[PDB]
Scaffold this motif. Sequence first.
Motif, PDB file in Angstrom:
ATOM      1  N   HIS E  19       0.830  -1.244   0.000  1.00  0.00           N
ATOM      2  CA  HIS E  19       0.000   0.000   0.000  1.00  0.00           C
ATOM      3  C   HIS E  19       0.869   1.303   0.000  1.00  0.00           C
ATOM      4  O   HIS E  19       0.554   2.321  -0.651  1.00  0.00           O
ATOM      5  N   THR E  20       1.954   1.284   0.770  1.00  0.00           N
ATOM      6  CA  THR E  20       2.833   2.459   0.818  1.00  0.00           C
ATOM      7  C   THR E  20       3.606   2.650  -0.480  1.00  0.00           C
ATOM      8  O   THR E  20       3.807   3.788  -0.890  1.00  0.00           O
ATOM      9  N   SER E  21       4.004   1.576  -1.165  1.00  0.00           N
ATOM     10  CA  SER E  21       4.631   1.679  -2.485  1.00  0.00           C
ATOM     11  C   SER E  21       3.671   2.310  -3.493  1.00  0.00           C
ATOM     12  O   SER E  21       4.049   3.211  -4.237  1.00  0.00           O
ATOM     13  N   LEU E  22       2.393   1.932  -3.463  1.00  0.00           N
ATOM     14  CA  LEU E  22       1.362   2.598  -4.257  1.00  0.00           C
ATOM     15  C   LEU E  22       1.113   4.045  -3.807  1.00  0.00           C
ATOM     16  O   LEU E  22       0.960   4.924  -4.648  1.00  0.00           O
ATOM     17  N   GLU E  23       1.108   4.334  -2.507  1.00  0.00           N
ATOM     18  CA  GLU E  23       0.876   5.693  -1.998  1.00  0.00           C
ATOM     19  C   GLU E  23       2.000   6.664  -2.406  1.00  0.00           C
ATOM     20  O   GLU E  23       1.753   7.855  -2.589  1.00  0.00           O
ATOM     21  N   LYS E  24       3.225   6.162  -2.611  1.00  0.00           N
ATOM     22  CA  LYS E  24       4.352   6.911  -3.188  1.00  0.00           C
ATOM     23  C   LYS E  24       4.183   7.214  -4.678  1.00  0.00           C
ATOM     24  O   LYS E  24       4.729   8.211  -5.155  1.00  0.00           O
ATOM     25  N   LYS E  25       3.470   6.355  -5.414  1.00  0.00           N
ATOM     26  CA  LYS E  25       3.349   6.398  -6.885  1.00  0.00           C
ATOM     27  C   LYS E  25       2.072   7.067  -7.387  1.00  0.00           C
ATOM     28  O   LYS E  25       2.111   7.742  -8.413  1.00  0.00           O
ATOM     29  N   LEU E  26       0.948   6.928  -6.689  1.00  0.00           N
ATOM     30  CA  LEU E  26      -0.287   7.648  -7.012  1.00  0.00           C
ATOM     31  C   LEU E  26      -0.103   9.169  -6.825  1.00  0.00           C
ATOM     32  O   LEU E  26       0.675   9.582  -5.961  1.00  0.00           O
ATOM     33  N   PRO E  27      -0.794  10.018  -7.605  1.00  0.00           N
ATOM     34  CA  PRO E  27      -0.675  11.468  -7.507  1.00  0.00           C
ATOM     35  C   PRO E  27      -1.459  12.026  -6.313  1.00  0.00           C
ATOM     36  O   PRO E  27      -2.546  11.549  -5.991  1.00  0.00           O
ATOM     37  N   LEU E  28      -0.928  13.070  -5.672  1.00  0.00           N
ATOM     38  CA  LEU E  28      -1.400  13.593  -4.379  1.00  0.00           C
ATOM     39  C   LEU E  28      -2.910  13.900  -4.372  1.00  0.00           C
ATOM     40  O   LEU E  28      -3.627  13.533  -3.439  1.00  0.00           O
ATOM     41  N   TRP E  29      -3.419  14.513  -5.442  1.00  0.00           N
ATOM     42  CA  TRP E  29      -4.843  14.837  -5.563  1.00  0.00           C
ATOM     43  C   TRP E  29      -5.734  13.593  -5.550  1.00  0.00           C
ATOM     44  O   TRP E  29      -6.851  13.651  -5.040  1.00  0.00           O
ATOM     45  N   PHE E  30      -5.249  12.458  -6.061  1.00  0.00           N
ATOM     46  CA  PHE E  30      -5.998  11.208  -6.046  1.00  0.00           C
ATOM     47  C   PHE E  30      -6.100  10.676  -4.622  1.00  0.00           C
ATOM     48  O   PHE E  30      -7.198  10.361  -4.173  1.00  0.00           O
TER      49      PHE E  30
END
Lengths: 40, 40, 47, 270, 43
Positions: E19-30
């Motif tokens: 989940h944290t690897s995805l939270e680093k890669k998804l854009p902040l507004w999302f």
Amino acid sequence: SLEMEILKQKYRLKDLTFLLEKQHELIKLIIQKMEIISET
Amino acid sequence: SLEMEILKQKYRLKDLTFLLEKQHELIKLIIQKMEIISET
Amino acid sequence: ISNVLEWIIYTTGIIFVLPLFVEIPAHLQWQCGAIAVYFYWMNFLLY
Amino acid sequence: SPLHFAASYGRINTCQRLLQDISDTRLLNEGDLHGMTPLHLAAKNGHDKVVQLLLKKGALFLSDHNGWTALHHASMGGYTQTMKVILDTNLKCTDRLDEDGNTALHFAAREGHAKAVALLLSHNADIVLNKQQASFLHLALHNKRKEVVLTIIRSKRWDECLKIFSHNSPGNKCPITEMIEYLPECMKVLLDFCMLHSTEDKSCRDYYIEYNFKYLQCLTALNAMVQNNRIELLNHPVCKEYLLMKWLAYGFRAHMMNLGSYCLGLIPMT
Amino acid sequence: ADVQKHASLKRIAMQVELHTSLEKKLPLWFLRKVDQKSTIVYP
């Protein structure tokens, strides 16, 4: 039994430190009420 | 040895709390006999 | 080994379908197929 | 010398005589070898009838060579009777800083006197960093003072205690990550405030329970719980629901999108 | 046995690292649009 033997030893150590805490307050009461003369 | 090491710890803490409760009965005997004057 | 297994799935999976263009022997078509089909399912364990 | 000994040992009758024959305030305010004064000696040993008598006689909240105030000694020792006497004379004393930037509340928390932390904190002490960039909450944590940190979480002031930390520090991070690093059973107690049952009987169709995540966000909290092996906090219902919520937020869709892009070659080749 | 000594922590360690690897890669507004500060459950 060590999964509780240390826990009973904790409560004995806890009442031991509570007894010493009650006894430090009497040693202070001695110095507070003691007659001091010829040492001052 | 821990399956008995804590049992010897029990008996050392037990004679330690017995020594402390005898020492407390003497500190009470001081305040009971102590000459209190001036700091009354 | 995740990089290597993916490297194999792509390079070999081309050759199992290449007949769609360059003519390739049946023997090679199914030698590459045997390897590619194996590694597609082994590398599914990493998903 | 004499008044110092008399006030150090609570000898209130000797004090009433020392301050009767001599009306001079130079004795009452006299600096000691350690830079101390009778009001510090009384406060340091927890005498509430002497620190009151010296304040009634007109003592001054002066400072030690180490920069400590009377209230700092009273806090360092946990002597609530003496702090309550001091605070009742001059509440303006409470915010004083020593020659190392600690306040009374830092000493109370660093030593583990919850009643003493509770008294200063509820009597409006000013929460601040000391010169080593650390707060009272941070001091309690680095000394594993469970009762003091539990008294702070139970406080009417908890959110103000939590907001004050040094973002530029590796040693004094967000207090939630420090609680996980040192006192996880206090973090368990803190997470119980994140859960609130509304109907008290689980068989009822209208029964519900709500989970609040404000402490797990800025995955820093659960990363800290994993790095500190906190399996009993990982398995807490607030953390289980926080992960499941994060998976339903985007983690499921992101996995099925990546796995589906692979499945696009996997199934056709079979 | 060693994998299973720490097994329960390894499940959750893998999930939070995913989940944290995805939270680093998804854009902040999302993350702001899609994440939620609290949720209800009906057992």
